[PDB]
Design a protein around this ligand. Structure first.
Ligand SMILES: O=S1(=O)CCCN1Cc1cccc(F)c1
Ligand SMILES: O=S1(=O)CCCN1Cc1cccc(F)c1
Lengths: 199, 199
């Protein structure tokens, strides 16, 4: 048995599992299946540990997984993340979004700006207004207006209703649909669908 | 898009990933690649969470993974396991070994008896003789002899040298070779090897 060739076959299969789990993560995020998203996320994270060298395409795939993971935890309150990252899940999603090797088109700016406002608004929704001000300081006349809204706990201001959570999710979901179409034809899902269609 | 058929394709692919990760877990255990075993174990555990209904063959596969996992942690000292299971990894491997749907042949008895003695000997090797006596009580003139050996801290007694750790590992490795031959032809590894052979 050639250990080198076995390790190569295992790397090929890890690459296939990564695409399959990204495809599944995208669908669960689109569908709102939280528990399924959490399980697929755990599987993708474990499979990714089995890879030590990634191609440009594989790096793009893992960063999309990390990005959707932070967006899904935007409203969740976990100190462990605040202990290590020292920022909020949505601020962490913003850092990933701005460094993915992808086109900075109109949809990229829309998603970026919605995450920027929602990183502040989710803290206000949770009643943590000191945190909302800290998030504002780390990200940013516009600044004066936005700071007055936070100071006045004006959570339901028309600005927040235009730059809403639902609007952020809809725009991110539209981007996820493009990822889903690109990967819908990857090896593992395509072979899995052919078995189900044969039955 | 039919959600039911997509979920079925995902179940088919989870089944393939399970066989692939079992195959990889078996090879890492056989080869002594500890870090690779730990990563494959984490991947198999995550993939298994994505399955809610398992066939008789799939249950056999997950129990082989659990069995090898306990054997690998036989000498490791972790209270969390002792907190939940309240037993030692090797006693836990013994419970799994005796309930896998498999033939109770000569090799099954050999492995069982080697695990039984090694669950005691690994505690003596770690200097925990009170624990070795507690393990002995939970598992078991033979008992009087074995208890005298533990009481006298006679770790290197000829009985322990015949029922050694190395002998336990060699017998378990021979069983793992049979598992490896049965699964060496599963879909994911077979398709992965064909890609590497083509290059
Ligand atoms: O980025 S992380 O903080 C590293 C620990 C898991 N986090 C999210 C994640 C989800 C899915 C795949 C992945 F590589 C990473
Ligand atoms: O049996 S456990 O205590 C459940 C938590 C993980 N443990 C070992 C394991 C390894 C690999 C696959 C599996 F299903 C289980």
């Amino acid at each position: 048995e050639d250990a080198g060739l076995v390790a190569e076959a295992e790397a090929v299969a890890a690459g296939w599992m990564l695409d399959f789990l990204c495809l599944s993560l995208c669908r669960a995020f689109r569908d709102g299946r939280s528990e399924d998203f959490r399980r697929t996320r755990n599987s993708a994270e474990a499979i990714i540990h089995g890879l030590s060298s990634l191609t440009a395409c594989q790096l793009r795939t893992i960063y999309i997984c990390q990005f959707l993971t932070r967006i899904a935890a935007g409203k969740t309150l976990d100190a462990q993340f605040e202990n290590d990252e020292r920022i909020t899940p949505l601020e962490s999603a913003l850092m990933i979004w701005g460094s993915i090797e992808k086109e900075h088109d109109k949809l990229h700016e829309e998603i970026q700006n919605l995450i920027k406002i929602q990183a502040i608004a989710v803290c206000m929704e949770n009643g943590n207004f000191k945190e909302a001000e800290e998030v504002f300081e780390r990200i940013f006349p516009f600044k004066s207006k936005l700071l007055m809204i936070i100071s006045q706990k004006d959570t339901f201001h028309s600005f927040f209703q235009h730059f809403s959570y639902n609007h952020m999710m809809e725009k991110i979901k539209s981007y996820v649909n493009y990822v889903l179409s690109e990967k819908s034809s990857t090896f593992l899902m395509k072979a899995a669908a052919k078995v189900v269609e044969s039955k």
